Design a protein around this ligand. Structure first.
Ligand code: URC
Ligand code: URC
Ligand code: URC
Ligand code: URC
Ligand code: CYN
Ligand code: CYN
Ligand code: CYN
Ligand code: CYN
Ligand code: NA
Ligand code: NA
Ligand code: NA
Ligand code: NA
Lengths: 295, 295, 295, 295
């Protein structure tokens, strides 16, 4: 036997950081969940019980807290780059660091129409994420994403003209509910290292904003011919508004809402144009994916 | 053996309803999860296989959809009352209906600063709930609640002066993080029946609003001496703003954020006034409960 | 305002304990999740910020570990009694302790047909639980339970003869799938205190065994007329095999498996006697409950 | 913009199938959750709203049930191959099918020491899975796995000799708890098509058995120097017992159990050799991965 691949590290590391403006008195909080997997010349840990090559995952944990203490944790793309760079620079035998981060929402509360200085709300379960790969000699590869963005439109969704054979029972429709949980990823041009990532720091928050904004507007205004069509239009626009993005990926479940025929009951009309009460279906669900790049 | 108690019904019934303004073109959506448990002279179903006394849970399901089709589903207190009343009025041998409803958020999207006519967002996992007990001869008992309201304040929380004995290691603190998931319940004066519930319909939405508003403001502004102290102040206020409420219940986890001593690392100062990076603790958690009524 | 009720404590306290037989070399492990809520003269903590009446939940946590260190953790009914008794005996102003415990499975592994001395498997997510209420002057009330016991039978289940009206669409059936997650609770005669609980210690494990055994056999052999009928028969038997039990409670979801009509496809016959492939339904589900006592 | 990649299908399709031995009267049940994603010439669905290229996910759902009706669903490797082959053979423009299957446990119950003919138990949440890729012109690639196999050993685990620097606080240990959730994958030699998969059908169940057996025995008997060392030994053995396997992948969380220093309490000794009560840590956790192939 031979080790073909190996990676190890710490997962599910919860981290909070507060910023306190000594002057204004305004505090700002950040919470994330961090995962770090390292690769390098560590194969002997697996084959001969050579733990000398192992940076203890406990130590990786410590390093996450220490890096958060010594550096900004925002934008996450930057923090992840700093953290990954640490490991490959610090340990000679460590040649790759993968850093995955989930950013949790702590939105500042408005009390009596006024933003509160130190009170926050988890206004949604929607996350902002980053996946950062720091590879010795190959720079820094960064994928940014939003996920758990749950939406529904009650009309202006359609699905007709799909293939029909002996396996097909679905009726064509020109008016349906469309609901999904948006998972959108934008993949950045390779960065040569931390300097290049730092030089672009403003664009991360700005591109996240754009991705969210375009997603919501496109979803809301597109008289959708299908999930496929609608999601391409989102990816289209995002690519046109940020040149440093190479690809845009969408993964969208179709969270079906079924009509309920109640005509059996006192001639109740609840289908078609009379459709009012629907049965949300927990499973199964359509799953539609696409990666859009530049022509 | 003898049956001491029995109840049966349908749980986890997902229901969507749309309202379409034919004139304005504005659509409004409602989604909930409904549970209905019936009691009455049904003991023979258990002891002698007498299914004649059973209103099939499948039929209860049907009835939920039909009631939603024929009546407003908002406010949930009303819908639940209508649904529970149906069962005890329709079936002679059914003497109690318990209706539990979870209301899911579908907040109308704002696109380009403008409210969209048919696109919505699950802006949080926070729920609005009702528990409605319709009992033959005893009227309608209603408990209303909000839950899954997740908050954090970064300062203006304290905990000192608690009992100290040989079991105590916790240090007193005059400055800590306080985070919780708010579960607040307001219990209504008994209602004689559906007429009385309908006569008060405006107060349900208004009292939910108040409960949420008071919860957030109290949390944000109280320089909390403890979870106990802070939650009583919330319950205090709500009781003073709606006379038809008899009690207010709070159940609040204390979602601990631990300081991290990094002094072992290059004399790093991250405790006390220098505390910046914290370890959110998933478990265990303090759990604090209280029911406040009128003196 | 006035406090009508109050309770506070620590929830989600994970605890592991190992027993090591110095002689045989056999180790035995126990894992549980503990929750402890206290009541007493603590109202001033809520109304006047008087923390002197508060036994810190952090301290309750400590006490859980210390009690586990100083006492057997099995059977859980005993451990919970010991723990609850501690709090009301130790603190003069604490008049009630509620202890909830979830026992997690660590079944000893059999390797090469031989029980291993220190290796275990979580052989199922099924739990054994206790709810123990230690009340000053009122003794010790104990409810024992098993939960998350997931079962299915593929035939020998029926449901016909239920009420039919204009709300009814379910077809009668003489052959269906029955699947559920068993939640069974047996409630013990009041105990005067710890001595009485200790005197009965063997009966706890024995009664849990019996409850499980009777549940599975009854489920498997009863040509069930309904969930109601079948569950009463379980409760019947358990009450007859342990006199110290006063009531038996069952809460059983009916986890529906729907037939799939495939006759639209090449005359495929998959209904009735030809039913082979079914659609498991995640929701909604029937929910059937009963408490059986002694005539 | 241009589509770089696209795939679509149905996820979370629950399927049950029963086998009824007309002679013996013995019934056997199978339950799984199926996911199917298709690739091919479907890009126009995304770019021009051309739904003619779309096999409706609703239809994919239908096809899953129909294939289960017409073919054995066991072993899952075979069923998945049959299902994937269907799609690329049936639809000219569909060039790849990915089929993911989760197999749920329904273990036959033993009643009074006797296997019951139609009653089953979900004896664990452990799953058996397959990932099957059917690619036109490139045959059938199959990855088989077991997951959710939760284990613990109370001793015979060690971790010393790891790197120590200014980031390191973990103490070396020669006696610790090791607990994990086993995710083991064995990747099969490419198959030319369905005939070749069918010719090997016995080896699938046999290789799953072996993988599980070797995992448990190695875990139980290895006086582990680390997770890394122990998992390689598992992968080593599996590769030596089934030549048609090319690689073996393990992904193992280290589910930490922390000692609890109780010496602050009445000199209580609960560390080192006196360690009895531990604090299971829900998060964070070490994560250790490796792919082992043939030298
Ligand atoms: O937008 C959709 N895309 C599909 O691929 C599909 N398949 C299906 O059944 N409904 C839908 N809807
Ligand atoms: O507000 C608090 N209340 C408590 O009862 C308690 N117990 C504890 O350890 N910390 C806290 N904090
Ligand atoms: O055993 C059953 N009990 C019910 O009360 C019921 N209701 C229903 O629709 N199916 C069933 N099955
Ligand atoms: O088996 C282990 N491997 C590691 O890589 C590691 N890291 C750590 O902190 N503890 C352990 N244990
Ligand atoms: C399916 N969309
Ligand atoms: C704990 N509060
Ligand atoms: C429904 N039982
Ligand atoms: C960490 N193992
Ligand atoms: Na390096
Ligand atoms: Na009645
Ligand atoms: Na007392
Ligand atoms: Na093809």
């Amino acid at each position: 036997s031979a080790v073909k691949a190996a990676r190890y590290g710490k997962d599910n590391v919860r981290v909070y950081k507060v910023h306190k403006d000594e002057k204004t008195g305004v505090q700002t909080v950040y919470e994330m969940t961090v995962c770090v997997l390292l690769e390098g010349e560590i194969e002997t840990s697996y084959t001969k019980a050579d733990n000398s090559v192992i940076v203890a995952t406990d130590s990786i944990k410590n390093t996450i807290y220490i890096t958060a203490k010594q550096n900004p944790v925002t934008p996450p793309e930057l923090f992840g780059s700093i953290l990954g760079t640490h490991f490959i620079e610090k340990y000679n035998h460590i040649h790759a660091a993968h850093v995955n981060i989930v950013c949790h929402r702590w939105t500042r509360m408005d009390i009596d129409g006024k933003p509160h200085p130190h009170s926050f709300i988890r206004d949604s379960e929607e996350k902002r994420n980053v996946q950062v790969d720091v590879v010795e000699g190959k720079g820094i590869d960064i994928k940014s994403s939003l996920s758990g963005l749950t939406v529904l439109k009650s009309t202006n969704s359609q699905f007709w003209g799909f293939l029909r054979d002996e396996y097909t029972t679905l009726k064509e429709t020109w008016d349906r509910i469309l609901s999904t949980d948006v998972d959108a990823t934008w993949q950045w041009k390779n960065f040569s290292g931390l300097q290049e990532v730092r030089s672009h720091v403003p664009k991360f928050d700005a591109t996240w904003a754009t991705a969210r904004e375009v997603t919501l507007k496109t979803f809301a205004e597109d008289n959708s011919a299908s999930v496929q069509a609608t999601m391409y239009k989102m990816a289209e626009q995002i690519l046109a508004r940020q040149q440093l993005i190479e690809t845009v990926e969408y993964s969208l479940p179709n969270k079906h809402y079924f009509e309920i025929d109640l005509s059996w009951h006192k001639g109740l009309q609840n289908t078609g144009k009379n459709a009012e009460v629907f049965a949300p279906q927990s499973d199964p669900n359509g799953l539609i994916k696409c990666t859009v790049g530049r022509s």
